[PDB]
Ligand binder design. Structure first.
Ligand SMILES: [Mg+2]
Ligand SMILES: [Zn+2]
Ligand SMILES: [Zn+2]
Lengths: 108, 1267, 87
DNA sequence: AAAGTGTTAAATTGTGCTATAC
DNA sequence: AGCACAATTTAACACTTT
DNA sequence: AGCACAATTTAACACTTTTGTCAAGC
DNA sequence: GCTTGACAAAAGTGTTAAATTGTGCTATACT
């Protein structure tokens, strides 16, 4: 038996060309550690503000649009997991308690 | 320089990759441990198969599908990020992973020797403790603050010490008051004695406990301060509590860390020039073990200092990712998936990296983070080279996973599996049968194999003829085997040669080109004369057929590798297409002479005439067609078309003894006339009984004097007449032909009586076990040889069993002695002799016990044959690899150096008898000097081929020594010259200017190694000589002339040579009693004169001592003689020029004594030409010549220490060659013929050099003129 | 490897392209252009009937009857016999 | 006389190799 | 498994404090 | 395991626009 | 050669419900 297999994809038979190709424009993004990346795009294409560059980190466009911080939060930052189960009056009457233990233990 | 790497290769440079280079190759960072979707079977984003980073899965389509045609190319889809381009750039773009903590490369830490250990002067057992998180390392210390605040720090330390002592004396005063209270209140009243003794004892016990607990903590506080006062970088703190005490207290005076970031910090503060100057000065001033160590460190420090390298590439910060088409995920039918075993290691690396990146941001204690970093280090080490440090990572089934290092090593590595030998298109194979009607250049081919082999040629030709409409109907017509294509296959097959090959391909004659001819059936019909060259027998062997396509390959098959252009062997020069087993006995039955046969030459004149004469051979043939004449009867024919011998033609014609039509009478047989009609027209009449040696002489003379197309037709005619007379010879085997000797019984009875007397003396008690073993062995050896003589003298001379042996057809006599007669002694499994022995023969049949005894040796021989043919291929491989750059470069270098040849020593009076081995050392050479007899003249001038008449003229002139030009003294830069090499043994003329003579020289030694059975004597002796090892039977040689004092002593020996000059004596102490002394001139003992390099014991002198004592011109004699002795003991003729080509590649280097001042480390092995170049330049800019002595080194050590880094990695130790080629930044130039084989270029030997492949060909004008 | 280039198919596709141009050259000037733009033999991207009618100045029904006559002319045995072997 | 202390040899571990085609 | 080989330890040494 | 809930991707349907086809006609 | 009217299928397009995927949480004690 023979057991043919294929990595999933295709092979097309257009003979290659190199003269008429729809026209392209180049954008340029700038990442956080001062790197510059040139990306080609079609002319009928809305050039986005942020691009995941070759460096591995996101880079904004070179213009001054400033599109969105999008109001993304922390998540749970402990505290929040402390404040959701225990209230402020129970902590303030505890912390000061612990604070007084700093006063009594220091002198005996 | 050329990333596309299309046909412009000047160099190929290796080097360490810095982290700025890894994120420059890469097309993006893979940040998820995902391969592919489970439903949609499409590659996920930011994973190990992501389109965005590695490329499109389909040709010219993006991921989302907005752009799907070639009109958009080079652009990037703005919604999915995938550049639309071809789709086979997925096997070439890389990718990288950013490590959240650094990781040392495993090749530069776990090598031998460890390069990180040499570069930092740290032990490997300490390096493994540092980088795998087991011991903190101090990486810096402020010497100024620790210097000046030392007094205040020890003053504060005395405060804490006295606080410990104060609490000690407080508890001691408490114990004193407590024991006073005990001895007061218990003894205030009347009490027992012994309980008061116990009370006073327990008080002393608690006082001792107090002062000793205080003593222990005082020693701890002393130890931490003694550790702080000796602080220095590259230290270790294995305690793991003492370091926290040094961090919370005196923690501002130093820095310490763990792992690869600390190794990176040590590499940062590493001044290479200080270590380089110190390592230069240690080997210049000091000595001992300290000097011998510092050379090893100076090697790697000078490697990082000289080039533009930097050691910061040894610790990693980004890991490259191989493109996903080299580790594919293939969907087998049935919906099954197969991954390529590199994906699991990449997944584990990016998994533990993501978990470290999460644990650091979350905030974690030090133990979890250190455990995560150690797991990350072990994951990257498992990726780069699995199973090196610790136990290997296994998958399901407890098999180790295949890492990146396991793709390159081994006999499976990319290197010896897919780069040096490939599978080819346009080829087939089949079984072989014998083809005794073919010519020498033809071979039959099965028509099915030739139809499938030649498929595009017939698919073109049956469209050039109107048999099919196009190429598709032509393909269908061929695959359906329609009856028109067999008329087209004979058209497209004519004059199109094919290469035939039979594995194993021992010498270069195992691949030969033939022209084909269509033969019905399914077996390849081989010619019955090339079977000696292939070593093929027709009991089921298979051969492979290859088809050369281009015009250059067809020309090479028609001119270079044709079967009838290669008659002789390149190893010895003997004809390899000589007749053999059946043809030899056919010509032996033809050309023999039987006295008293039918129709002999009678003459009994006086009453009737002679009646033995014939007018012509035609009348003799007409007589033999009646019953009157036998073919082997002596007659007197009158030949008018055969040239007479020189003795008869000299007295008959003399001035012009031509024979196209002049008559002469010859007293011969008829059979010798019918033999000599096969030989050429100008060849003299032979009139001898054709042995095999006579036919070897005849074909050798035809190859010397007659052109190459005459020898092939003559050999074909000889095979035809040989088969036709072997079938009439009447050679059959029956049991009535196996004559037993008629007095075997009395011989065996007499030697049995002698053996019975020996056994009676042993049973009485006279001689011991081994002595009676040896006596029985001697008695039965004499019995064996005596029954052999009786059998030899009993047989008639025309027996069918003895004619096959005596004609040299096949076999030898000893097997016949085992057929009728006596088997003899049979070996043990141990190797000793069974003292029984086997007294039966294979015609009388053996008994049960004799057969069971015989099976021991009969199976040991088969196992030894398998292991020996396993061992010989390794030796052939090493010999090819050490000597591939010895090719012929120019015509003449015009040197005047040369070796001398022994060449027929005197006698006792005695004029001059020949040396036995002249045809292997003095034939096919060139003269360095003009030969001169006793004031004479120049008898044989300089530069002649030293053939047969020149050798006979030198022997007639009375000169017994000749200085001969050779390849050991050739004076070209790269390779040898043509006149220094001599005559090529295969062609018979001078060697051409592109012959790769090193490979021919390696194959000539590697081929007959299977017939070498066996201080050692067989193939381990050749393996010991060519590896230049020290032998186990090492025999001492003298260092100087003088007198030898031989002394016995404490049961081994003592030999002290005292010179005649004099000077310091030489003393050799311990020579074991098994090694007997050595005869030349009585025998050596004491009271003896010694020569310079005289051998003192028997055994084997090591070549290093004879190189050191007697120089290179004697070590060449020793190596050539000790190899050729092993090859002569088994009857194998290899000419000495091949062994000299091998031996020249050993002595190419010198070792350095004193460096002078030119970049040469002491103890390094440098080439002799580069050494003399750097000693040529040194007379300018300050004269200090580097001093070095010549060295002799084996073929593995020299083959590994070569310039080319790509040719040495493909041979042995690929990891440790690839890892110190990269440190030195060693470049390649592609000049040998092992790297041009790898990269796909033309090799620089043969038709690949410039002067042969830059030929311009144009028609002469007269012809362009006449057209 | 099933996604590889079969060497006796990539030659046949080239000879099919050459035979296609050799058959299309025996037609007229406009009908060959109508077919080559309708099936995208020159550029690779096919066109609609309005796309050819824009460049030839007629409606979709004029282009469609030109194509329906050309496809009947190509089903002639002199134009079908040399192409029937490629399917 | 003990007690280290560094320098110099036999034991001690690890690395690499082991024919060819179906 | 073994055969070779080179790197890395116990121990065997005189030399210098204690 | 098992469940609950938000975020995201898919598929399904309604409705509009394009692209194609038939008969008539100068 | 060529255009107009009319009709019907095919293709985009928007919205909306479902299915699918991602993530947090479960409190006798357990080392
Ligand atoms: Mg055989
Ligand atoms: Zn897309
Ligand atoms: Zn020369």
């Amino acid at each position: 038996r023979v057991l043919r297999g294929s990595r999933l994809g295709a092979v097309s038979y257009e003979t290659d060309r190199n003269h008429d190709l729809a026209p392209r424009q180049i954008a340029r993004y700038r990442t956080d550690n001062g790197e510059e990346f040139e990306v080609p795009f079609a002319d009928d294409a809305e050039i986005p503000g942020t691009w995941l560059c070759r460096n591995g980190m996101e880079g904004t466009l070179i213009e001054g649009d400033l599109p969105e911080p999008k109001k993304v939060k922390p998540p749970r930052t402990h505290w929040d997991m402390l404040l959701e189960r225990r209230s402020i009056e129970e902590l303030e009457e505890l912390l000061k308690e612990r604070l007084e233990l700093i006063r009594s233990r220091r002198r005996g | 320089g050329a990333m596309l790497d299309v046909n412009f290769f000047d160099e190929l440079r290796i080097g360490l990759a810095t982290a700025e280079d890894i994120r420059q190759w890469s097309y993006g960072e893979v940040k998820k441990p995902e391969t592919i979707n489970y439903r949609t079977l499409k590659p996920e984003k930011d994973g190990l198969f992501c389109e965005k980073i590695f490329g499109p899965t389909r040709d010219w389509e993006c991921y989302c599908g907005k752009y799907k045609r070639v009109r958009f190319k080079g652009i990037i889809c703005e919604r999915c990020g995938v550049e639309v381009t071809r789709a086979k750039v997925r096997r070439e773009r890389m990718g990288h992973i950013e490590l959240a903590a650094p990781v040392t490369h495993i090749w530069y830490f776990k090598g031998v020797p460890s390069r990180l250990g040499y570069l930092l002067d740290l032990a490997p057992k300490d390096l493994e403790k540092i980088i795998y998180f087991a011991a903190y390392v101090i990486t810096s210390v402020d010497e100024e603050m620790r210097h000046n605040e030392l007094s205040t720090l020890e003053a504060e330390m005395a405060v804490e010490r006295k606080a410990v002592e104060d609490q000690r004396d407080g508890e001691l005063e408490a114990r004193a008051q407590k024991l006073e209270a005990d001895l007061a209140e218990l003894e205030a009243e009347g009490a027992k004695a012994d309980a008061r003794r116990k009370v006073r004892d327990g008080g002393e016990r608690e006082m001792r406990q107090i002062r000793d607990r205080a003593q222990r903590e005082l020693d701890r506080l002393e130890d931490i301060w003694s550790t702080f006062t000796k602080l220095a970088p590259k230290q270790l703190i294995v305690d793991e509590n003492l370091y926290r005490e040094l961090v919370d207290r005196y923690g501002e005076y130093f820095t310490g860390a763990m792992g690869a970031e600390s190794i990176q910090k040590l590499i940062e503060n590493f001044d290479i020039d200080a270590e380089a100057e110190s390592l230069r000065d240690v080997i210049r001033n000091g000595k001992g073990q300290k000097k011998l160590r510092a050379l090893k460190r100076l090697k790697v420090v000078a490697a990082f200092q000289q080039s533009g390298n930097s050691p910061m590439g040894m610790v990693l910060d980004a890991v490259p990712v191989i493109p996903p088409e080299l580790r594919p995920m293939v969907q087998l039918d049935g919906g099954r998936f197969a991954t390529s075993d590199l994906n699991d290691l990449y997944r584990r690396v990016i998994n533990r990296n993501n978990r470290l990146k999460r644990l650091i941001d979350l905030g974690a204690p030090e133990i979890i983070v250190n455990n995560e970093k150690r797991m990350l280090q072990e994951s990257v080490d498992a990726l780069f080279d699995n199973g090196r440090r610790g136990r290997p990572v296994t998958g399901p089934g407890n098999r180790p996973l295949k890492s990146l290092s396991d793709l390159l090593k081994g006999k499976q590595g990319r290197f010896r599996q897919n780069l040096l030998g490939k599978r080819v298109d346009y080829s087939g194979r089949s079984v072989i049968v014998v083809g005794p009607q073919l010519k020498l250049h033809q071979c039959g081919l099965p028509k099915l194999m030739a139809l499938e082999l030649f498929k595009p040629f017939v698919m073109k030709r049956l469209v050039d003829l109107n048999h099919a409409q196009n190429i598709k109907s032509a393909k269908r017509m061929v695959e359906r085997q329609r009856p028109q294509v067999w008329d087209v296959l004979e058209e497209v097959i004519a004059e199109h040669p094919v290469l035939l090959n039979r594995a194993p391909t021992l010498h270069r004659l195992g691949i030969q080109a033939f022209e084909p001819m269509l033969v019905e059936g399914k077996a390849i019909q081989l010619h019955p004369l090339v079977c000696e060259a292939f070593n093929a027998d027709f009991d089921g062997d298979q051969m492979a057929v290859h088809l050369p396509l281009s015009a250059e390959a067809q020309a090479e098959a028609r001119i270079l590798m044709l079967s009838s252009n290669n008659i002789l062997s390149p190893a010895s020069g003997r004809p390899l297409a000589m007749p053999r087993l059946d043809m030899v006995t056919g010509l032996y039955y033809l050309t023999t002479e039987v006295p008293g046969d039918t129709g002999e030459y009678q003459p009994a004149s006086g009453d009737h005439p002679e009646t033995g004469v014939y007018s012509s051979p035609a009348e003799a043939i007409m007589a033999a067609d009646r019953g009157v004449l036998s073919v082997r009867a002596k007659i007197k024919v009158r030949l008018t078309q055969l040239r007479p011998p020189v003795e008869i033609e000299a007295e008959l014609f003399g001035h012009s003894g031509w024979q196209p039509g002049d008559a002469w009478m010859a007293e011969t047989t008829l059979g010798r006339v019918m033999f000599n009609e096969l030989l050429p027209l100008g060849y003299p009449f032979v009139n001898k009984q054709m042995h095999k040696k006579v036919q070897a002489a005849i074909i050798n003379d035809l190859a010397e004097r007659y052109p190459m197309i005459v020898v092939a037709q003559t050999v074909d005619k000889l095979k035809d007449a040989g088969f036709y007379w072997a079938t009439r010879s009447g050679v059959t085997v029956s049991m009535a032909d196996v004559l037993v000797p008629p007095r075997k019984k009395e011989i065996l009875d007499h030697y049995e009586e002698r053996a019975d007397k020996v056994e009676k003396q042993f049973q009485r008690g006279a001689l011991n076990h081994d002595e009676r073993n040896e006596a029985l062995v001697e008695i039965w050896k004499e019995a064996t040889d005596e029954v052999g003589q009786a059998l030899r003298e009993h047989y008639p001379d025309d027996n069918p069993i003895i004619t096959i042996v005596d004609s040299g057809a096949t076999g030898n006599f000893t097997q016949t002695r085992t057929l009728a007669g006596m088997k003899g002694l049979v070996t043990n499994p141990k190797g000793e002799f069974i003292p029984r022995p086997v007294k039966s023969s294979f015609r009388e049949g053996l008994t049960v016990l004799e057969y069971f005894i015989n099976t021991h040796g009969a199976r040991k021989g088969l196992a030894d044959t398998a292991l020996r043919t396993a061992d010989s291929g390794y030796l052939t491989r090493r010999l090819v690899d050490v000597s591939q750059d010895v090719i012929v470069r120019e015509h003449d270098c015009q040197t005047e150096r040369g070796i001398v040849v022994e060449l027929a020593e005197r006698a006792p009076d005695g004029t001059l008898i020949r040396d036995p081995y002249i045809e292997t050392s003095a034939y096919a050479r060139t003269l360095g000097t003009d030969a001169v007899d006793e004031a004479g003249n120049v008898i044989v001038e300089r530069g002649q081929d030293l053939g047969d008449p020149e050798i006979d003229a030198l022997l007639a002139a009375g000169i017994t020594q000749v200085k001969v030009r050779s390849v050991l003294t050739c004076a070209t830069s790269t390779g040898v010259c043509a006149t220094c090499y001599g005559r090529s043994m295969a062609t018979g003329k001078l060697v051409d200017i592109g012959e790769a003579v090193g490979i021919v020289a390696a194959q000539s030694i590697g081929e007959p190694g299977t017939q070498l059975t066996m201080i050692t004597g067989g193939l381990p002796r050749v393996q010991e000589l060519f590896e230049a090892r020290v032998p186990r039977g090492k025999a001492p040689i003298a260092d100087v002339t003088g007198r030898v004092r031989l002394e016995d002593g404490e049961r081994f020996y003592k030999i002290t040579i005292v010179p005649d000059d004099g000077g310091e004596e030489v003393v050799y102490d311990k020579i074991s009693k098994r090694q007997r002394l050595r005869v030349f001139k009585r025998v050596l003992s004491d009271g003896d004169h010694v020569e310079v390099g005289q051998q003192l014991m028997e055994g084997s002198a090591d070549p290093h001592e004879v190189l050191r004592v007697q120089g290179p011109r004697e070590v060449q004699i020793h190596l050539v003689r000790e190899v050729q002795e092993v090859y002569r003991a088994q009857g194998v003729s290899i000419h000495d020029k091949h062994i000299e080509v091998i031996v020249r590649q050993m002595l190419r280097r010198v070792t350095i004594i004193d460096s002078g001042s030119t970049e040469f480390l002491p103890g390094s092995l440098i080439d002799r030409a580069e050494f003399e170049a750097e000693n040529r330049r040194v007379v300018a800019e300050g004269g200090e010549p580097a001093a070095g002595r010549p060295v002799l080194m084996g073929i593995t050590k020299a083959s590994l220490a070569t310039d080319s880094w790509l040719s040495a990695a493909s041979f042995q130790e690929t990891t440790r060659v690839l890892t110190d080629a990269a440190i030195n930044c060693r470049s390649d130039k592609l000049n040998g013929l092992k790297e041009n084989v790898i990269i796909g270029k033309l090799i620089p030997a043969g038709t690949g050099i410039n002067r042969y492949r830059n030929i311009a060909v144009q028609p002469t004008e007269e012809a362009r003129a006449a057209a | 490897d099933s996604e590889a280039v079969v060497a006796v198919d990539a030659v046949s596709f080239t000879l099919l392209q050459d035979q296609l141009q050799s058959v299309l050259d025996t037609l007229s000037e406009r009908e060959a252009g109508v077919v080559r733009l309708r099936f995208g033999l020159t550029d690779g991207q096919p066109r609609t009937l309005d796309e050819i009618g824009q460049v030839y100045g007629v409606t979709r029904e004029r282009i469609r009857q030109i194509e329906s006559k050309t496809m009947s002319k190509l089903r002639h045995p002199s134009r079908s016999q040399v192409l029937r072997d490629y399917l």
